Amino acid sequence: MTLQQRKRLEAFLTQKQKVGELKDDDFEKISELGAGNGGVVFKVSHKPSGLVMARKLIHLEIKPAIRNQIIRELQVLHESNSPYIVGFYGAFYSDGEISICMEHMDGGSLDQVLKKAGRIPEQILGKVSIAVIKGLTYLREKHKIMHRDVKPSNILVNSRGEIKLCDFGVSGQLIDSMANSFVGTRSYMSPERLQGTHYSVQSDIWSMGLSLVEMAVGRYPIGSGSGSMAIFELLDYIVNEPPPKLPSGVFSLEFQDFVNKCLIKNPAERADLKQLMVHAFIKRSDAEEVDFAGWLCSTIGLN
Ligand SMILES: Nc1ncnc2c1ncn2[C@@H]1O[C@H](COP(=O)(O)OP(=O)(O)NP(=O)(O)O)[C@@H](O)[C@H]1O
């Protein structure tokens, strides 16, 4: 960490300790923040402390006997102490749905930023790459299994110039399984399928590479039609055809090679985290003095 980084993490932890127990009645809804794959996310105000939080709701029935362990598990699963993972305030349950309260990122997600930005400049994506790598490094240490992908909608930013990942250690699907595990977990997936589900960090690197190309050109780089047929044809194209690449003559050689090494089809030849962190693009980006906060505030009109 660095001085300002640890300090901000310390400050957040102080705020977390001051909040205490989280109950639904203590929240006032301000605005909807975004629409998720598993439930909507709202900007809320925690009245007793006056803290602005992001409140994610997950529709699920949790029985009273099951409830206490589920919550206690959720508290643990969200315990992050990284400057690159979105802060976590607490989780609770009321009336057939679960609330996950986290640090409000007033810059929104990068898919939202991308929409207003059109496309995101290479030097900005340099800072994004560094944060994602360090975020993935921290997550892989804490969890053996990831449950969420690297994608623009999962990269949150703010006016302090911070770039963070959502906690990949938890998903709405996992929580469902946890609730089911008290009745009796039944998996009918073959060993080879389960091995595929427990993907290595090489899959995260692929996702980062594809996301970087998407954000650099302002569009998901592999086009597809609508309907079931077009969906299958897209996935088959990803599996069996050459990966997408940046439009030639636009971006630096370093950034070009960086995303190409992330998108190599063979995961054994695909670059790993160590190789990426010392890549020419990363070393150049780390040296660059980039005003991310300034660009962000000008782009989405933060101030
Ligand atoms: N802590 C936060 N601060 C600000 N905005 C947030 C926060 N969390 C989520 N959002 C916004 O709400 C949207 C919904 O997030 P989420 O429910 O995680 O959807 P998702 O990530 O697309 N689903 P998944 O496919 O499981 O990752 C995000 O894309 C963000 O724009």
Numbering used by the authors: 42 to 344
Article excerpt on this structure:
The extracellular signal-regulated kinase (ERK) cascade, consisting of three tiers of protein kinases (Raf, MEK, and ERK), mediates mitogenic signals and is critical for a wide range of physiological and pathological processes, including cell proliferation, differentiation, embryonic development, and carcinogenesis. Activated Ras interacts with and activates the Raf family protein kinases (ARaf, BRaf, and Raf-1), which then phosphorylate two conserved Ser residues within the T-loops of MEK1/2, which in turn phosphorylate ERK1/2. Previous structural analyses of inactive MEK1 suggested that its helix A, which is present in the N-terminal extension of the kinase domain and is a structural feature unique to the MEK family kinases, stabilizes the inactive conformation of the N-terminal lobe of the kinase19,20.
The WT C121 residue is in the N-lobe proximal to the helix C (P105-H119), which generally serves as a regulatory element of protein kinases, and resides juxtaposed to the helix A. Firstly, C121S mutation not only led to destabilization of the inhibitory helix A, but also affected the orientation and conformation of the helix C and the T-loop. This excessive outward displacement allows the helix C to create a coiled-coil-mediated stable interaction with the newly-formed α helix (residues 213–224) in the T-loop, thereby inducing an extended, open conformation of the T-loop. In contrast, the DFG motif of MEK1(C121S) adopted the DFG-out conformation. The R189 side chain is rotated toward the ATP-binding site and directly coordinates AMPPNP (an ATP analog) via the formation of electrostatic interactions with the phosphate groups of AMPPNP.
